[PDB]
């Protein structure tokens, strides 16, 4: 199993995962100078811009390395946001979103 097909897949689902995210709210870091209690009970913040870093700096060798953090984006705003947000329902709405496009991008890489 080639790394540079890989990370071609890697980028791609990326890129798909992100246009669910139409409000680009997971765009970026959450501000922590504008939710500065956002640290008490978030241990590891994610964000699809890191995650594209970390994809880059070839951190991500197998399919759950690059699944874990975008799931991290989801339950990260799932824990930190009221049910009753349009941030909760957002989250809610990537993670149902992102189902095919996680699953038909695994297929590819068991593939390879
Ligand atoms: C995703 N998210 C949060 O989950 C919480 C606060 C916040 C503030 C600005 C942008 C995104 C944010």
Request: hydrophobic fraction near 40%; charged fraction near 30%.
């Amino acid at each position: 199993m080639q790394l540079t097909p890989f990370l071609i897949l890697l980028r791609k689902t990326l890129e798909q995962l992100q246009e669910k995210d139409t409000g680009n709210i997971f765009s970026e870091p959450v501000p922590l100078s504008e939710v500065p209690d956002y640290l008490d009970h978030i241990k590891k913040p994610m964000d699809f811009f890191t995650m594209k870093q970390n994809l880059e700096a070839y951190r991500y060798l197998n399919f759950d390395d690059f699944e874990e953090d975008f799931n991290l984006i989801v339950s990260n705003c799932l824990k930190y946001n009221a049910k009753d947000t349009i941030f909760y329902r957002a989250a809610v709405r990537l993670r149902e979103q992102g189902g095919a496009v996680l699953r038909q991008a695994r297929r590819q890489a068991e593939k390879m």
